[PDB]
């Protein structure tokens, strides 16, 4: 047996972190140490400030004997919400944050930073609207207020998976726009939404 612990902790990072603007998400780091005890972690930008004030984790169970064994690793839950307005550039391969994590054991050994990547995307990437039941209208090019209400209700009823804070609008010819809370959108063309009532009876 060696008189001292000279080996830093080992960190496992999640391999495919995907976040949608305005929606809470979470991912876990798993950490072990040959001593069985991890003291704390640091999230950084390769040693510089993290710069993501919306990302949080709990220090529950940090620096407790036995908290970080091979059989029972330390599981660190990181969570937050990418801001509703976070800019997504034209090349969506650039819509990500690459950051680093390291950890200390109780003997002062600190691991070397390893990377993790938070990819983020518009809410319209998460949601795929189903077509509503058809609303039958008197004039295909000039919907009444009651017909627009019915279209919106039908679009909403065909899509309970879509967020309640998304806003559904309807044009004069029955074209549907779904505007998600982050202002990304989805469209349903009118021919999938309305049909002429007289033509259909």
Q: Binding site for Ca(2+): residue ranges?
A: 5, 7, 33-34, 105, 109, 124-125, 127, 152, 186
CB of 17 to Ca ion, least distance (A): 15
CB of 155 to Ca ion, least distance (A): 10
Our measurement of the distance from residue 192's CA atom to the centroid of its chain's CA atoms, rounded to an integer in Å, reads: 30
Residue whose structure tokens are 């650039």: 94
CB of 165 to a second copy, least distance (A): 4
Q: Between residue 103 and residue 132, which ones bind Ca ion under the rule CB under 5 A?
A: 105, 109, 124-125, 127-128
Binding site residue list: 5, 7, 33-34, 105, 109, 124-125, 127, 152, 186
Residues for the chain: how many in total? 201
Residue whose structure tokens are 């001593």: 35
Q: Does 21 bind a second copy (CB under 8 A)?
A: no
Q: Which is nearer to a second copy, 56 or 138 (CB)?
A: 138
Question: Of 87, 86, 114, 112, which Cα lies nearest the Cα of 98?
Answer: 114
SS3 125: helix
Question: Of 1, 62, 58, which Cα lies nearest the Cα of 34?
Answer: 1
Q: Does 180 bind a second copy (CB under 8 A)?
A: yes
Q: Does 135 bind Ca ion (CB under 5 A)?
A: no
Q: Alpha-carbon distance 39 to 63, whole Å? A: 4
Mask of contacts with Ca ion, 44-83, x by CB under 5 A? ----------------------------x-----------
Question: Of 74, 102, 89, 92, which Cα lies nearest the Cα of 18?
Answer: 92
The 10 Å Cβ neighbour count of residue 188 is: 22
Query: Applying CB under 5 A, which residues contact Ca ion?
Result: 5, 7, 33-35, 72, 105, 109, 124-125, 127-128, 186
């Amino acid at each position: 047996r060696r008189a001292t612990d000279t080996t830093p902790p080992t960190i496992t990072v999640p391999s495919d972190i995907i976040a949608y603007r305005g929606e809470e998400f979470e991912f876990y780091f798993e950490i072990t140490d040959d001593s069985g005890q991890v003291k704390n972690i640091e999230l950084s930008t390769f040693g510089k400030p993290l710069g993501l004030n919306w990302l949080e984790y709990s220090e529950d169970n940090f620096n407790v004997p036995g908290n970080a064994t091979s059989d029972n690793p330390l599981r660190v839950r990181v969570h937050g919400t990418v801001p509703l307005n976070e800019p997504i550039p034209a090349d969506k391969n650039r819509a990500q944050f690459t950051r680093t994590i390291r950890a200390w054991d109780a003997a002062g050994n600190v691991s070397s930073n390893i990377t993790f990547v938070i990819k983020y995307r518009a809410q319209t990437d998460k949601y795929n609207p189903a077509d509503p039941t058809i609303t039958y209208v008197d004039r295909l090019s000039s919907l009444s207020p009651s017909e627009k209400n019915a279209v919106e209700a039908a679009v909403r009823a065909a899509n309970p998976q879509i967020p309640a804070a998304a806003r559904i609008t309807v044009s004069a010819n029955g074209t549907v726009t779904i505007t998600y809370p982050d202002s990304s959108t989805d469209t349903i063309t009118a021919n999938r939404v309305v049909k002429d009532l007289a033509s259909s009876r």
